[PDB]
Amino acid sequence: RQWALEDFEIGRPLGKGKFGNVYLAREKQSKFILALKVLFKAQLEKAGVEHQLRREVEIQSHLRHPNILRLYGYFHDATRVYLILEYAPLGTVYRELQKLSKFDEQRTATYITELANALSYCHSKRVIHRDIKPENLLLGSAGELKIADFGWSVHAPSSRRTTLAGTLDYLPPEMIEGRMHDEKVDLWSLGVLCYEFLVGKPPFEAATYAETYKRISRVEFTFPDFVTEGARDLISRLLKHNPSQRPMLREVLEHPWITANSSKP
Template sequence: MNRSLHAKQPSQSNVSKLLTKFAAPNPFPTKPGHPPSSLLNPNQTSRQPSPTNASNALKEKGIDIGKYDGGLEIDDEKRGQLIYGEAAEDLALDSSVSRKHPTREWHLTDFDMGRPLGKGKFGRVYMVRTKAEPKYILALKTLYKSEIVQSKVEKQIRREIEIQQNLRHPNVLRLYGYFHDTKRIFLMLEFAGKGELYKQLSKHGCFSERRSSRYIDQMADALSYLHGKHVIHRDIKPENLLLGINGELKIGDFGWSVHAPGNRRMTLCGTLDYLPPEMVEGKEHNEKVDLWALGVLTYEFLIGNPPFEDRSSVSNTYRRIAKVDLKFPATISVEVKDLITKLLQYDPQRRLALSSVLKHPWIVKYRPKDTVRPSGGHT
């Protein structure tokens, strides 16, 4: 697959493109002296893999975090103004005073800085290690407050942080904590050891049915968890997925996510190739937009391109989505065609439920024998 031709429509002002190439180990204690497990969801069962093994592996190998390039100091001289008033209050974000999951108080001086992992719209991402034992490795992402204000995304940033900090699932990238100084907000993110899934897809062109099935199995379990918490992701696509230290999939971008207990939304958001008919046609939508995106993702994993893409015209892509103009190459199995067809339904109510995705023959066929999934998904 020639990815240079495969130019996707970008997410609208995608505020939280996670450029972390490496991700972090164990959850942090909420307070000094508490065991790391105190940050795990109390409902988390043994079917979910413990992060401890990955954590120990990182510590045992004595991972080199690389050389710091002084970028934070350089940026501090060149960019970002002080903000005042209501905007300053809105962006004084600190997880030590979080109502649900307060952490210890963090400061930039608590970390050994390592190599840069990338640049986001509002700042840089660095590989860092906590100075205190046990020396955890994570990705530290910076956001400049004045640039957030200029882009008028204060509420979106706050919402994204609040949503992500409350999520505890092995296939969802963890936000361990956050803190701020006069100009910046710092996000302490999990360190996704095997990088961006999009890069893997670009490298291979497409994935085998076995690999695709295992990723979709993990996606369906994670989405079931999110929907059980009334979180709609709304921007599922390969660019927003990362791979953990053991190659496990991680949903890593919550810039368009919304906590919607009422589950009816009108905002047009996400990425064109992954938009469902109800969004294209300007209708109300609910969590079933993520089911459509799961079908598109399955197709793209196997074929290398999303199913409704038309490189000659954006309007043709819209038209194909609205008509559900779905074509399959002869190379893919009857089983996966069945799954994709049942997810890519025009009527959101007819899309296959996540609990049924987890029991679908194509998913069960390739699931590792030691993996246990709940019969009805998460609640």
């Protein structure tokens, strides 16, 4: 319908990002529990990202996959926009990592499997996330991982330009077939996560922003002793400077270390 605020009972904050203030909510007629992600219009306008929010809604709302958070709808008033999200009751992977410091191999491999299933669904539909990180990985009621926060995602086949439908005559194949953007970006992220999950720190961590930038551009990481051979092999394959040398998701899902340790298919 055209949902509005008065259709919901509001509960506690679930989390805060740079932009979203997310609240537990209950729809009044159904008593169905969900999450409201609230954004300030003034802040969206000041940062120049109103377009991104539009894309977050257009792209996420159409995805259907158990490892991807549903977005059900939206509404707005004079000062705010409200996104109606599936409620993830077990929090963020970020918070679980604060709690446990580091994950064992079985938990890590299980998370990587679920993330790779979600990203293969996305990438097969030309959706690229571009913001994979622990705070945007939520946990459902059986502890299964759910990708969320499609703020920076892209989907060339539904892009503004594609919809304008200009002449193709001067455009290369990569652009006309909605292949303009590189999905390998998400594969790097997956490697960063797998390392961080096992080690408790991301591979390119440093004091300053400048030192961090250097570490990443040079791919300067090392492994602690306890990281096993199989885990080193997978991380090393994902963290390639050259995007085209990073593996297909099918190779992540079938990696021997993954298949030996993952509890999920």
